[PDB]
């Protein structure tokens, strides 16, 4: 876990009383699949 990942997890936790706007909610959870590659060859996508 990277330093900014460390901060990230904290920020996400920090978004907990409710009052939480959409931009907060998007900033808290996002969907993406990092597609790792080798040389062409592709270790198949897995959620970021």
């Amino acid at each position: 876990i990277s330093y900014a990942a460390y901060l990230n997890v904290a920020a996400q936790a920090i978004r907990s009383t409710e009052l939480q706007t959409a931009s907060v909610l998007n900033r808290s959870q996002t969907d993406a699949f990092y597609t790792q590659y080798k040389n062409a060859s592709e270790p198949t996508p897995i959620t970021k």
Partner: protein, 120 residues
């Protein structure tokens, strides 16, 4: 002049007294302070412009007095009132999360946040 900024907001982008929670404990900047680079830990932050005082709850970030008297504070999220009961509910969950569980480390971060909440 103080700079306080978030990715999604800008808060103060000097300002009389700023009290900051850092790797080096807590650091205070008042007028000119000598130039520092300090990583801000998960935090409770106070900014005072005159006697008027504003209290911020901060997710950690970076602090840098620039040698041109620009206190660059950058952090992911700052109002302390907004953060403040739902968080208590979460804290129960976070204890549960530590029990089962990088996920272990994440739950440890949740414990750090739990401490950070206790200050509030």
């Amino acid at each position: 002049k103080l700079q306080f900024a978030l990715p999604h907001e800008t808060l103060y982008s000097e300002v009389t007294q700023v009290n900051l929670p850092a790797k080096s404990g807590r650091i205070g900047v008042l007028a000119n302070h000598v130039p520092t680079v300090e990583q801000l830990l998960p935090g409770v932050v106070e900014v005072m412009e005159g006697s008027n005082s504003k209290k911020f709850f901060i997710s950690g970030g970076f602090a840098t007095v620039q040698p041109d008297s620009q206190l660059c504070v950058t952090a992911i999220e700052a109002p302390l009132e907004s953060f403040s009961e739902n968080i208590k509910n979460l804290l129960a969950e976070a204890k549960k999360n530590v029990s089962s569980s990088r996920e272990a480390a994440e739950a440890a971060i949740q414990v750090e946040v739990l401490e950070n909440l206790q200050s509030v």
